[PDB]
Amino acid sequence: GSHMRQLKIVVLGDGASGKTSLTTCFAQETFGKQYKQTIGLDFFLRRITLPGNLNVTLQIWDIGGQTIGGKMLDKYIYGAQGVLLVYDITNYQSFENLEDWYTVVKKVSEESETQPLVALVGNKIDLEHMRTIKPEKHLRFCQENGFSSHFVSAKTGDSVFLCFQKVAAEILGIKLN
Amino acid sequence: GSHMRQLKIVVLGDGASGKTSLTTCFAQETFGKQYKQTIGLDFFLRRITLPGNLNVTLQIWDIGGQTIGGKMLDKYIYGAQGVLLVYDITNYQSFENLEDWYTVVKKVSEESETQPLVALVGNKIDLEHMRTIKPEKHLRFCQENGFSSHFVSAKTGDSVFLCFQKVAAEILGIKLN
Ligand SMILES: Nc1nc2c(ncn2[C@@H]2O[C@H](COP(=O)(O)OP(=O)(O)NP(=O)(O)O)[C@@H](O)[C@H]2O)c(=O)[nH]1
Ligand SMILES: Nc1nc2c(ncn2[C@@H]2O[C@H](COP(=O)(O)OP(=O)(O)NP(=O)(O)O)[C@@H](O)[C@H]2O)c(=O)[nH]1
Ligand SMILES: [Mg+2]
Ligand SMILES: [Mg+2]
C-alpha cells in the first residue's frame, strides 16, 4: 500500500541558474562542473519523510531554460503544486529574467484557477563573494509576490535538501519546527 | 487538506490511435473529428472518486506519436504508475507499432527497477464493422504480456471512463465489484 502522495514541483529559470544541478543534488546527491544544457525538460522523483512519518514523493520537473521562448512551457507549468524560480546570485540577467518566467506562472495560475506555492531560490551561494544580486532585492521580490525565500548551493549542497523539504512542507501545510 | 493521491498515467501509441481524443473524452468530455497532431506531449488532470470515497487524481501524459523517434520518450515514461498502449482497431500499422512503444516501456521498467501497470486499449470501436485487428489477437497480446484489456471509443465515449477508472483501481489495488 501507498498514499501515492505525489507533488508536482516545477523548476524554472535562465540557463545560468543551475536548475539541473539543484535537482540532481537533491534527487541523487551529485554535482557536475561541465554545463550540459537541458533540452525541453527532464523529470526526477524523490521520496522524503516529513514529521509525523508523513511520506511524500516530489515529482520534479526540471525545465530547460530555452523553453521560455515557446508555448510548451505553459503546459509544463499546468497542474504544479510548487514552482521554484531559480537564479544565479552572481548573474544579474538570470535574476531579471525571472519576471518572464513568473509572468507565465501567473498566466497559467489565472486560467487554471489554481495557486501553486512559489519559491524564490538564489543558487550558487558558494560564490557569495562575487554576488551581484543584493539580498535586500531578493527579499523585496519575495515580499511583493508572497514567495518563500531560499538561498542554496547545488555545488556544496548547502541548504538544498532543506529547500525542497520546506517547499513540500509548505504545500502540504505541515509545521517543520 | 488533501491526500494528494496522484497517479502518473502515460498514454502511448501511433499517431492514428486517438490518444488525445481518448484523454480529452475522459478529462473534459469532448471530441474533435479534425486531426490536430500532438507535438511532444500534453498534460491533463482529472480527479475521480473510487469506491469507499477514495479520491484520486490522474495525471495524464498525452504523448505525441512522433516521440517514438527520439530519446525524450524514455524520460516521459519514467515514473509512470500506469501506461496505456493505444491502437486504432481499424489500422494494422498502429497495432504492429505497439511493439516499439512497449519495448521502450520495458527498457525503462528494467532500468528504473519499476513495474507500472500496462493496459492495451483498442480505440475506435465505433468503427467495429471495419475492424482489422481480430479480438483474438488483442487478447493474445494481453496474455503474452500481462496487460489489462480495454476496448473503447473516444468518439462515442463508449467505455472511456470505465477504462481510466479500471486502470486507476488496478494501480491502487481496489475492487470495483
Ligand atoms: N559554483 C556553482 N556553480 C553551479 C552551481 N549550480 C550550478 N552551477 C554551474 O552552473 C552551470 C549551469 O548548471 P545547470 O544545472 O546545467 O543549469 P540549468 O539551470 O539546468 N541550465 P539549462 O536550463 O540550460 O538546462 C554549470 O556549469 C554548473 O556546474 C552552484 O551552486 N555553484
Ligand atoms: N471514429 C473515430 N475516430 C477517432 C476516435 N478517436 C480518435 N479518432 C480520430 O482519429 C484521429 C486522431 O485522433 P487523435 O486523438 O488526434 O490521435 P493521437 O493518437 O493523439 N495522434 P498524435 O500522436 O499525432 O497526437 C482524429 O481524426 C480523430 O478524430 C474514435 O474513437 N473513433
Ligand atoms: Mg538544465
Ligand atoms: Mg495527440
Curated annotation (Swiss-Prot), chains A, B:
Residues annotated as binding Mg(2+): T20, T38, D62
E.C. numbers: 3.6.5.2
Full-sequence portion shown in this chain: 11 to 183 of 221
Reaction(s) catalysed by this chain's protein: GTP + H2O = GDP + phosphate + H(+)
Chief place of localization: membrane
Family statement: Belongs to the small GTPase superfamily. Rab family.
The protein's enzyme class: hydrolase
Cofactors (names): Mg(2+)
An example Gene Ontology biological process: intracellular protein transport
Protein known as: Ras-related protein Rab-28
Protein species of origin: Homo sapiens
Spans annotated as Switch I: 29-43
A Gene Ontology term for the protein's cellular component: ciliary basal body
Signal peptide: none
